Structure formats: C-alpha cells, structure tokens
Amino acid sequence: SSVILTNYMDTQYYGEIGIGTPPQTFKVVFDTGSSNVWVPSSKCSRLYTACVYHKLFDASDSSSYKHNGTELTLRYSTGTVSGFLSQDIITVGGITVTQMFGEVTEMPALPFMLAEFDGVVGMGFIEQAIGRVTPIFDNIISQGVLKEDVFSFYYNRDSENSQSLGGQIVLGGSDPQHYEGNFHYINLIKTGVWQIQMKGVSVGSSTLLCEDGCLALVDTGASYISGSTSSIEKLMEALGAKKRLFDYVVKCNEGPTLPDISFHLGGKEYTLTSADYVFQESYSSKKLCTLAIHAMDIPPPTGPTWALGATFIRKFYTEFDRRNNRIGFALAR
Ligand SMILES: CCc1nc(N)nc(N)c1-c1ccc2c3ccccc3n(CCCOC)c2c1
Ligand SMILES: *[C@@H]1O[C@H](CO)[C@@H](O)[C@H](O)[C@H]1NC(C)=O
C-alpha cells in the first residue's frame, strides 16, 4: 500500500489515516523517529487552543473502540504531548490493523498551533515505543500480507500548484516511479533505531566535520537535517551564516553561491547543493534566507547524532528495511 502525502511549505509531510468505526480521519506525520501513534483527543480541554484547531478522536462515536486509559507522555526534540492509551481499528491506505494509540489530552499551543497535521504515526522499532506499545508497522507485518518487510519514503519538493503529490509512503516496498539508479544500503548500527554509521560530513572541498566518524539518525518526522550544537556552529561558520533564534540565516543574495554539503554514508557521498538546503525565497541582499539545517542536541542513548530529515529525503528516496536492518538510499525522481 502507498499513502499520498501532503507537503506543507517543505517542512511538514502528512497523510491520512482512519481510526474507529465509522472512520474518524486524521492528518498524520509518518515518523521513523518515534514509535507511537497518537491523535488529538476529545477529552482534551479546549483551554488547549491546539485542540480547538485539530481533529479530535471521539471514543464515544466508535463501535470498535477498546478502552485502556494507561497514561503516556511522548517527548520529541521540539515539543511534548501527553494523554492515555486507547485501541481501535486504524486504516492506513488499504491495510486495516487493530492498533493501540494514545489519545492526547495535552497539546501545547507552541508548537502544535503551527502544526498542519493532527497527530503522529511512529514508524520506529518497539525498542523505542513508550509504554512498550506495539508499533503499527509490527502489527501490519503480523498480518503477513505485505510483500516485504520494508517501507519507503518519497518527499517531493514544495509546489505552488496543487497538482503534484507532496510525497508518498509505500508499505511493503519501493516505488520505482520516484527513484533512479540503484539503492545503496547501509547497516543499522543497532536494531531498534533507524540510525546508521556516517563516515563524515564535508562542506565544499574540506571534510571539516564528523571526521573520525559519527552517528546519523534518518528521521522522516524531522523537517531539517540536524547536528550537535557544536558541529552546526562549525558548519554554519564555514557558510558565513548567522545564528538566529530558531534557525540560521544567510543573506539571500549569497544563497545560490553557497557550497555543497556532502554526507559520507556507507561509502557513497550524498551531495546536497545550496538549492537543496536553502529556502531561496529572494535574491535581495537586504533580506535574510533560512537554511534547512538546524542545531539539535539529541541526548543518549540515541545521541549525540546527526538527524537526516526532510531536507535530506527530498533528494534521496529512502527505503527502510526491517528484515535486513538496513537503510537504502536512491536518487529521488
Ligand atoms: C512527527 C513527530 C516528530 N518526530 C520526531 N522524531 N521529531 C520531531 N521533532 C517531531 C515533531 C514534533 C512536533 C512538530 C511540529 C509542531 C508544529 C509544526 C511542525 C512540527 N513538526 C515538524 C513536522 C515534520 O514533518 C515531516 C514537528 C515534529
Ligand atoms: C492497556 O494495554 C496494555 C498492553 O497490553 C495492557 O497490558 C494493560 O493491561 C491495558 N490496561 C487496561 C486497563 O486496559
């Protein structure tokens, strides 16, 4: 099965899923960076404005709902959500699985008021599941209907005309329609995390970063490519970028000229051009231009690690192989 994804300003990729009977729909981000499923709850006080602006699942309208109520708190690098567990049938572009998800009752205005999506579907391993809840992919695999134990991601570039698909996620394989050349796999450092060994990072012709090696987290639920506060400060100085509050800007006229940034993974340089990582929204020297790379200190046991999010996936079609515990990359088409 494949799921059409909507691309919102190149920073948010989501698709639809139905929960309960009759189906209650939600826009969700398929996150290889987390392992739980959650959507806003009707029990969420309207004092939480974010709940006022998103779809809320109502248990009392689902004849297939199974109560549980165990509390859970999900913690992401850029925000937190809290609530309790519930069970019901979830629809994912064809497949139907009885999933255990979290009904969020605390959805902070900042940042969720900025979210176009309603919730999250974790595509990570159970080792990272909060509350030891079985991840949705594990369940789908159990059904034994998928052609292969893998899922692929395709994140298209932004578009000013609602006629091109913002992205697509395939359950059980890849879609040749969106990649060229062959994949090039890398082995997961440790199973339970979509993290691989990254040999080095280069900014132009001078591998000034991640020498000696470092970690790379392939996060479909993250907007940009991130690095330790240290690594980024050093990468950003090399680009002549200034550090703002939430991002790094560069004078727009200097954006097209910026150097390439390469990530050495499994022996193959994945190169990104300035056009690939800069939000060139102007050419004025009197305007600032946001870079699609941020600084995000990810704690143990996962970090310190770089995070390859949407900025990286837009250029490289990614396939997550559960059966071989490996990640594959191919030129996105
Ligand atoms: C999908 C959940 C998620 N997973 C992971 N691994 N990291 C995150 N930082 C987030 C997380 C949390 C809140 C918001 C969040 C809140 C408001 C606006 C945008 C937001 N984004 C970016 C969406 C990127 O989609 C590809 C968020 C991401
Ligand atoms: C909630 O689900 C977990 C997972 O199986 C289960 O162990 C627990 O007993 C459930 N709690 C209730 C009260 O339904």
Short mmCIF file of all heavy atoms in Angstrom, two decimals, residues 6 8 10-14 28-35 38 54 75-81 107-117 119-122 153 155 217 219-224 296 309-310, ligand 1:
data_model
loop_
_atom_site.label_atom_id
_atom_site.label_comp_id
_atom_site.label_asym_id
_atom_site.label_seq_id
_atom_site.Cartn_x
_atom_site.Cartn_y
_atom_site.Cartn_z
N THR A 6 0.80 15.09 1.88
CA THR A 6 0.65 16.50 1.58
C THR A 6 1.91 17.20 2.04
O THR A 6 2.42 16.94 3.14
CB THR A 6 -0.58 17.07 2.30
OG1 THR A 6 -1.75 16.43 1.78
CG2 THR A 6 -0.68 18.57 2.10
N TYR A 8 3.49 20.64 3.10
CA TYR A 8 3.21 21.99 3.56
C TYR A 8 4.52 22.73 3.74
O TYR A 8 5.31 22.42 4.63
CB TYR A 8 2.44 21.95 4.88
CG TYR A 8 2.21 23.32 5.48
CD1 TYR A 8 1.52 24.30 4.77
CD2 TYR A 8 2.72 23.66 6.72
CE1 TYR A 8 1.36 25.57 5.28
CE2 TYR A 8 2.57 24.94 7.24
CZ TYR A 8 1.89 25.89 6.51
OH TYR A 8 1.74 27.17 7.01
N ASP A 10 7.39 22.61 2.61
CA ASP A 10 8.64 21.86 2.72
C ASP A 10 9.07 21.53 4.15
O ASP A 10 10.19 21.08 4.37
CB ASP A 10 9.79 22.60 2.03
CG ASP A 10 10.07 22.07 0.64
OD1 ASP A 10 9.29 21.24 0.14
OD2 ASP A 10 11.08 22.49 0.05
N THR A 11 8.19 21.76 5.12
CA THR A 11 8.57 21.47 6.49
C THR A 11 7.63 20.52 7.20
O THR A 11 7.86 20.16 8.35
CB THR A 11 8.63 22.75 7.32
OG1 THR A 11 7.34 23.37 7.32
CG2 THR A 11 9.67 23.70 6.76
N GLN A 12 6.58 20.10 6.52
CA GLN A 12 5.62 19.19 7.12
C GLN A 12 5.05 18.24 6.08
O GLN A 12 4.48 18.68 5.08
CB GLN A 12 4.48 19.98 7.76
CG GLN A 12 4.86 20.70 9.03
CD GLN A 12 3.70 21.48 9.61
OE1 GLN A 12 2.57 20.99 9.68
NE2 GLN A 12 3.98 22.72 10.03
N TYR A 13 5.22 16.95 6.31
CA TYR A 13 4.70 15.94 5.39
C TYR A 13 3.72 15.04 6.13
O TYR A 13 4.08 14.37 7.10
CB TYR A 13 5.83 15.12 4.78
CG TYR A 13 6.71 15.90 3.83
CD1 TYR A 13 7.73 16.71 4.31
CD2 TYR A 13 6.51 15.85 2.46
CE1 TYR A 13 8.53 17.44 3.45
CE2 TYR A 13 7.30 16.57 1.58
CZ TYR A 13 8.31 17.36 2.09
OH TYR A 13 9.09 18.09 1.23
N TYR A 14 2.47 15.02 5.67
CA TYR A 14 1.47 14.19 6.32
C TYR A 14 0.53 13.47 5.37
O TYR A 14 0.41 13.83 4.20
CB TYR A 14 0.66 15.03 7.31
CG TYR A 14 0.12 16.33 6.75
CD1 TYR A 14 -1.15 16.40 6.17
CD2 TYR A 14 0.87 17.50 6.81
CE1 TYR A 14 -1.65 17.58 5.68
CE2 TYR A 14 0.37 18.69 6.33
CZ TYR A 14 -0.89 18.73 5.76
OH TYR A 14 -1.40 19.92 5.29
N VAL A 28 -1.68 12.80 9.62
CA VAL A 28 -0.57 12.38 10.47
C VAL A 28 0.78 12.36 9.77
O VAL A 28 0.86 12.15 8.55
CB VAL A 28 -0.81 10.96 11.04
CG1 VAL A 28 -2.09 10.92 11.85
CG2 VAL A 28 -0.87 9.95 9.89
N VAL A 29 1.83 12.58 10.55
CA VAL A 29 3.19 12.54 10.02
C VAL A 29 3.70 11.12 10.27
O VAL A 29 3.56 10.60 11.37
CB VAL A 29 4.12 13.50 10.77
CG1 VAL A 29 5.53 13.35 10.27
CG2 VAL A 29 3.65 14.92 10.58
N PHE A 30 4.26 10.48 9.24
CA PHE A 30 4.80 9.14 9.44
C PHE A 30 6.24 9.37 9.83
O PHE A 30 7.08 9.79 9.05
CB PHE A 30 4.63 8.29 8.17
CG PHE A 30 3.18 7.96 7.87
CD1 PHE A 30 2.36 8.85 7.19
CD2 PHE A 30 2.61 6.78 8.36
CE1 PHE A 30 1.02 8.58 7.00
CE2 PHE A 30 1.27 6.51 8.17
CZ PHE A 30 0.47 7.40 7.49
N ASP A 31 6.49 9.09 11.11
CA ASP A 31 7.76 9.35 11.77
C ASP A 31 8.66 8.15 12.06
O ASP A 31 8.33 7.32 12.92
CB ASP A 31 7.42 10.08 13.07
CG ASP A 31 8.62 10.50 13.86
OD1 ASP A 31 9.75 10.51 13.32
OD2 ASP A 31 8.43 10.84 15.05
N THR A 32 9.79 8.05 11.37
CA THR A 32 10.73 6.96 11.61
C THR A 32 11.52 7.32 12.86
O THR A 32 12.34 6.53 13.32
CB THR A 32 11.73 6.78 10.46
OG1 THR A 32 12.41 8.02 10.22
CG2 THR A 32 11.01 6.32 9.20
N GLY A 33 11.26 8.51 13.38
CA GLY A 33 11.95 8.99 14.57
C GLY A 33 11.27 8.70 15.90
O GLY A 33 11.83 9.00 16.95
N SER A 34 10.06 8.15 15.87
CA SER A 34 9.34 7.79 17.09
C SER A 34 8.68 6.44 16.82
O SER A 34 8.80 5.90 15.72
CB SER A 34 8.31 8.87 17.45
OG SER A 34 7.43 9.15 16.37
N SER A 35 7.99 5.87 17.81
CA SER A 35 7.38 4.56 17.62
C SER A 35 5.95 4.43 18.11
O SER A 35 5.40 3.34 18.14
CB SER A 35 8.23 3.48 18.31
OG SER A 35 9.58 3.52 17.89
N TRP A 38 -0.39 8.59 17.80
CA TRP A 38 -1.23 9.45 18.60
C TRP A 38 -1.99 10.47 17.78
O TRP A 38 -1.50 10.94 16.75
CB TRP A 38 -0.40 10.18 19.67
CG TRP A 38 0.48 11.30 19.18
CD1 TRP A 38 1.80 11.22 18.87
CD2 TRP A 38 0.11 12.68 18.97
NE1 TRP A 38 2.28 12.45 18.49
CE2 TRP A 38 1.26 13.36 18.54
CE3 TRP A 38 -1.09 13.39 19.10
CZ2 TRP A 38 1.25 14.72 18.24
CZ3 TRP A 38 -1.10 14.74 18.80
CH2 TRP A 38 0.07 15.39 18.38
N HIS A 54 -7.65 21.26 15.72
CA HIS A 54 -7.31 19.98 15.11
C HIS A 54 -8.41 18.96 15.27
O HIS A 54 -9.31 19.12 16.11
CB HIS A 54 -6.02 19.42 15.69
CG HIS A 54 -4.80 20.15 15.24
ND1 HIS A 54 -4.35 21.28 15.86
CD2 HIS A 54 -3.98 19.94 14.19
CE1 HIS A 54 -3.30 21.75 15.21
NE2 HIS A 54 -3.06 20.95 14.19
N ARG A 75 7.78 12.46 24.11
CA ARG A 75 8.73 13.57 24.10
C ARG A 75 9.56 13.68 22.83
O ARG A 75 10.37 12.81 22.52
CB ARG A 75 9.64 13.47 25.33
CG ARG A 75 8.84 13.63 26.62
CD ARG A 75 9.68 13.76 27.88
NE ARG A 75 8.86 14.33 28.94
CZ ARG A 75 9.31 14.68 30.14
NH1 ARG A 75 10.59 14.50 30.45
NH2 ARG A 75 8.47 15.25 31.02
N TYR A 76 9.36 14.76 22.10
CA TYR A 76 10.10 14.99 20.87
C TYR A 76 11.10 16.12 21.07
O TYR A 76 11.02 16.86 22.05
CB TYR A 76 9.15 15.34 19.72
CG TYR A 76 8.03 14.33 19.52
CD1 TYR A 76 6.77 14.57 20.03
CD2 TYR A 76 8.24 13.14 18.84
CE1 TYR A 76 5.74 13.65 19.87
CE2 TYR A 76 7.22 12.21 18.67
CZ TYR A 76 5.97 12.47 19.19
OH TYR A 76 4.93 11.58 19.02
N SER A 77 12.04 16.26 20.15
CA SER A 77 13.05 17.29 20.24
C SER A 77 12.48 18.69 20.21
O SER A 77 13.10 19.64 20.70
CB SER A 77 14.06 17.13 19.10
OG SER A 77 13.42 17.27 17.85
N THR A 78 11.29 18.84 19.65
CA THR A 78 10.73 20.17 19.55
C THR A 78 9.39 20.37 20.22
O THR A 78 8.70 21.35 19.95
CB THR A 78 10.62 20.55 18.07
OG1 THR A 78 9.89 19.54 17.37
CG2 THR A 78 11.99 20.68 17.46
N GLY A 79 9.02 19.45 21.10
CA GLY A 79 7.74 19.57 21.78
C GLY A 79 7.31 18.28 22.45
O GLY A 79 7.85 17.21 22.17
N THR A 80 6.29 18.38 23.30
CA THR A 80 5.79 17.23 24.04
C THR A 80 4.27 17.10 23.99
O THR A 80 3.58 18.11 23.90
CB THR A 80 6.21 17.34 25.52
OG1 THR A 80 7.64 17.33 25.61
CG2 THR A 80 5.66 16.19 26.33
N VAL A 81 3.77 15.87 24.03
CA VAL A 81 2.33 15.63 24.06
C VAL A 81 2.07 14.59 25.14
O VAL A 81 2.92 13.76 25.44
CB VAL A 81 1.76 15.10 22.72
CG1 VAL A 81 1.83 16.18 21.68
CG2 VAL A 81 2.51 13.87 22.27
N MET A 107 -1.91 19.21 24.44
CA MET A 107 -1.27 19.56 23.18
C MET A 107 -0.89 21.04 23.20
O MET A 107 -1.67 21.91 22.80
CB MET A 107 -2.28 19.30 22.06
CG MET A 107 -1.70 19.07 20.70
SD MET A 107 -3.09 18.76 19.58
CE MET A 107 -2.23 18.78 17.94
N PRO A 108 0.33 21.34 23.67
CA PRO A 108 0.84 22.71 23.77
C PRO A 108 0.71 23.61 22.54
O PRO A 108 1.08 23.24 21.43
CB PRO A 108 2.29 22.52 24.24
CG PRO A 108 2.59 21.10 23.93
CD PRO A 108 1.32 20.38 24.18
N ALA A 109 0.16 24.80 22.77
CA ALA A 109 -0.04 25.80 21.73
C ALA A 109 1.25 25.94 20.93
O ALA A 109 1.24 25.89 19.70
CB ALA A 109 -0.43 27.14 22.35
N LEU A 110 2.35 26.15 21.63
CA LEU A 110 3.65 26.22 21.00
C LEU A 110 4.22 24.83 21.27
O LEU A 110 4.38 24.44 22.41
CB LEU A 110 4.53 27.29 21.65
CG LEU A 110 4.50 28.68 21.00
CD1 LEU A 110 3.08 29.16 20.87
CD2 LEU A 110 5.30 29.66 21.84
N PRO A 111 4.54 24.07 20.21
CA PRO A 111 4.41 24.44 18.80
C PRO A 111 3.20 23.94 18.03
O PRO A 111 2.99 24.32 16.89
CB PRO A 111 5.67 23.85 18.22
CG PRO A 111 5.67 22.49 18.90
CD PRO A 111 5.31 22.82 20.34
N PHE A 112 2.39 23.08 18.64
CA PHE A 112 1.29 22.50 17.89
C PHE A 112 0.26 23.37 17.18
O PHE A 112 -0.43 22.88 16.29
CB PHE A 112 0.63 21.41 18.73
CG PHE A 112 1.57 20.27 19.03
CD1 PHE A 112 2.29 20.23 20.21
CD2 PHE A 112 1.84 19.32 18.05
CE1 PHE A 112 3.25 19.27 20.41
CE2 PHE A 112 2.80 18.36 18.25
CZ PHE A 112 3.51 18.33 19.44
N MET A 113 0.17 24.65 17.53
CA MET A 113 -0.75 25.55 16.85
C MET A 113 -0.20 25.78 15.45
O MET A 113 -0.92 26.22 14.55
CB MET A 113 -0.86 26.90 17.55
CG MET A 113 -2.00 27.01 18.55
SD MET A 113 -3.61 26.59 17.83
CE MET A 113 -3.62 27.56 16.39
N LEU A 114 1.09 25.48 15.27
CA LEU A 114 1.74 25.65 13.98
C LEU A 114 1.68 24.39 13.13
O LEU A 114 2.06 24.40 11.96
CB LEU A 114 3.20 26.05 14.18
CG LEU A 114 3.47 27.37 14.91
CD1 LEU A 114 4.96 27.59 14.98
CD2 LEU A 114 2.80 28.53 14.19
N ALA A 115 1.18 23.30 13.72
CA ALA A 115 1.06 22.04 13.01
C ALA A 115 -0.13 21.99 12.08
O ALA A 115 -1.23 22.40 12.45
CB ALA A 115 0.95 20.90 14.00
N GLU A 116 0.09 21.50 10.87
CA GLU A 116 -0.98 21.34 9.89
C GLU A 116 -1.56 19.95 10.10
O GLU A 116 -2.72 19.69 9.80
CB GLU A 116 -0.43 21.47 8.47
CG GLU A 116 -0.47 22.89 7.92
CD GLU A 116 -1.84 23.27 7.38
OE1 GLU A 116 -2.30 22.62 6.41
OE2 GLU A 116 -2.46 24.21 7.91
N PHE A 117 -0.74 19.05 10.63
CA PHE A 117 -1.19 17.70 10.89
C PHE A 117 -1.88 17.64 12.24
O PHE A 117 -1.76 18.57 13.04
CB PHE A 117 0.01 16.74 10.90
CG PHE A 117 1.12 17.17 11.82
CD1 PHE A 117 1.26 16.61 13.08
CD2 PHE A 117 2.05 18.12 11.41
CE1 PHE A 117 2.30 16.98 13.93
CE2 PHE A 117 3.09 18.50 12.25
CZ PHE A 117 3.21 17.93 13.51
N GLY A 119 -1.84 14.49 14.18
CA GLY A 119 -1.06 13.63 15.04
C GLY A 119 0.12 12.92 14.40
O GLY A 119 0.60 13.29 13.32
N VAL A 120 0.60 11.87 15.08
CA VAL A 120 1.75 11.13 14.59
C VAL A 120 1.63 9.61 14.56
O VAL A 120 1.02 8.99 15.44
CB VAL A 120 3.00 11.50 15.42
CG1 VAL A 120 4.24 10.86 14.81
CG2 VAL A 120 3.12 13.01 15.51
N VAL A 121 2.23 9.01 13.54
CA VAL A 121 2.26 7.57 13.42
C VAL A 121 3.73 7.20 13.43
O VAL A 121 4.46 7.51 12.49
CB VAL A 121 1.64 7.09 12.09
CG1 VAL A 121 1.82 5.58 11.96
CG2 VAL A 121 0.16 7.48 12.03
N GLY A 122 4.17 6.57 14.52
CA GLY A 122 5.57 6.18 14.62
C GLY A 122 5.95 4.97 13.78
O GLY A 122 5.32 3.91 13.86
N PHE A 153 9.98 6.01 1.62
CA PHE A 153 9.56 7.40 1.69
C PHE A 153 9.99 8.22 0.49
O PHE A 153 11.12 8.11 0.00
CB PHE A 153 10.11 8.08 2.96
CG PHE A 153 9.21 7.97 4.15
CD1 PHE A 153 9.06 6.77 4.82
CD2 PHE A 153 8.48 9.06 4.59
CE1 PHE A 153 8.21 6.67 5.89
CE2 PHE A 153 7.63 8.96 5.66
CZ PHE A 153 7.49 7.76 6.31
N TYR A 155 9.61 12.28 -0.50
CA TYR A 155 9.19 13.64 -0.14
C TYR A 155 9.51 14.53 -1.32
O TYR A 155 10.68 14.76 -1.61
CB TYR A 155 9.96 14.17 1.07
CG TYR A 155 9.44 13.69 2.40
CD1 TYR A 155 10.17 13.92 3.56
CD2 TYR A 155 8.25 13.00 2.50
CE1 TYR A 155 9.73 13.47 4.79
CE2 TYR A 155 7.80 12.54 3.73
CZ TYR A 155 8.55 12.78 4.87
OH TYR A 155 8.11 12.32 6.10
N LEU A 217 20.93 9.78 12.25
CA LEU A 217 19.58 9.30 12.51
C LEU A 217 18.77 9.69 11.27
O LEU A 217 18.76 10.86 10.89
CB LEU A 217 19.05 9.98 13.78
CG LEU A 217 17.87 9.38 14.54
CD1 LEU A 217 16.54 9.85 13.94
CD2 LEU A 217 17.98 7.86 14.53
N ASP A 219 15.54 10.46 10.15
CA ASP A 219 14.23 10.81 10.68
C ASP A 219 13.21 11.39 9.70
O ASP A 219 13.30 12.56 9.33
CB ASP A 219 14.45 11.78 11.84
CG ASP A 219 13.23 11.97 12.69
OD1 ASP A 219 12.14 11.55 12.26
OD2 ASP A 219 13.36 12.53 13.79
N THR A 220 12.23 10.59 9.30
CA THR A 220 11.21 11.08 8.37
C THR A 220 10.28 12.11 9.01
O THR A 220 9.58 12.85 8.32
CB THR A 220 10.31 9.94 7.84
OG1 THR A 220 9.69 9.26 8.95
CG2 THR A 220 11.12 8.96 7.01
N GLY A 221 10.27 12.14 10.34
CA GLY A 221 9.41 13.06 11.04
C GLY A 221 10.07 14.37 11.41
O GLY A 221 9.48 15.18 12.12
N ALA A 222 11.29 14.59 10.93
CA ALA A 222 12.02 15.82 11.21
C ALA A 222 12.09 16.67 9.95
O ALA A 222 12.34 16.16 8.86
CB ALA A 222 13.41 15.50 11.70
N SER A 223 11.89 17.98 10.10
CA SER A 223 11.92 18.88 8.96
C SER A 223 13.29 19.05 8.32
O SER A 223 13.44 18.90 7.11
CB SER A 223 11.42 20.27 9.35
OG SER A 223 10.06 20.22 9.73
N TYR A 224 14.29 19.37 9.13
CA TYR A 224 15.61 19.61 8.59
C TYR A 224 16.64 18.55 8.92
O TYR A 224 16.32 17.52 9.52
CB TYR A 224 16.13 20.96 9.09
CG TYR A 224 15.05 21.99 9.30
CD1 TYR A 224 14.36 22.06 10.50
CD2 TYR A 224 14.67 22.85 8.27
CE1 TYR A 224 13.32 22.96 10.68
CE2 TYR A 224 13.64 23.76 8.44
CZ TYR A 224 12.97 23.81 9.65
OH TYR A 224 11.93 24.69 9.82
N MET A 296 20.42 20.66 16.83
CA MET A 296 19.53 19.98 17.76
C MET A 296 20.29 18.93 18.55
O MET A 296 20.61 17.87 18.02
CB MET A 296 18.38 19.31 16.99
CG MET A 296 17.23 18.92 17.88
SD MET A 296 16.61 20.36 18.77
CE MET A 296 15.51 21.08 17.53
N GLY A 309 16.64 14.57 8.16
CA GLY A 309 15.21 14.70 7.98
C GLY A 309 14.73 14.97 6.57
O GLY A 309 15.34 14.54 5.60
N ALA A 310 13.64 15.71 6.47
CA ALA A 310 13.05 16.05 5.19
C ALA A 310 14.02 16.70 4.19
O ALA A 310 13.97 16.42 2.99
CB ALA A 310 11.83 16.96 5.40
C1 LIG B 1 6.37 13.83 13.80
C2 LIG B 1 6.75 13.89 15.28
C3 LIG B 1 8.23 14.22 15.49
N1 LIG B 1 9.10 13.18 15.42
C4 LIG B 1 10.41 13.37 15.60
N2 LIG B 1 11.21 12.30 15.51
N3 LIG B 1 10.97 14.57 15.86
C5 LIG B 1 10.13 15.62 15.93
N4 LIG B 1 10.72 16.81 16.18
C6 LIG B 1 8.73 15.53 15.75
C7 LIG B 1 7.84 16.73 15.80
C8 LIG B 1 7.05 17.19 16.88
C9 LIG B 1 6.23 18.38 16.74
C10 LIG B 1 6.24 19.07 15.50
C11 LIG B 1 5.57 20.27 14.97
C12 LIG B 1 4.65 21.18 15.53
C13 LIG B 1 4.19 22.27 14.73
C14 LIG B 1 4.64 22.43 13.38
C15 LIG B 1 5.57 21.50 12.83
C16 LIG B 1 6.02 20.42 13.64
N5 LIG B 1 6.90 19.40 13.35
C17 LIG B 1 7.62 19.17 12.07
C18 LIG B 1 6.91 18.14 11.17
C19 LIG B 1 7.86 17.46 10.18
O1 LIG B 1 7.14 16.53 9.38
C20 LIG B 1 7.90 15.83 8.41
C21 LIG B 1 7.03 18.60 14.46
C22 LIG B 1 7.82 17.45 14.60
#
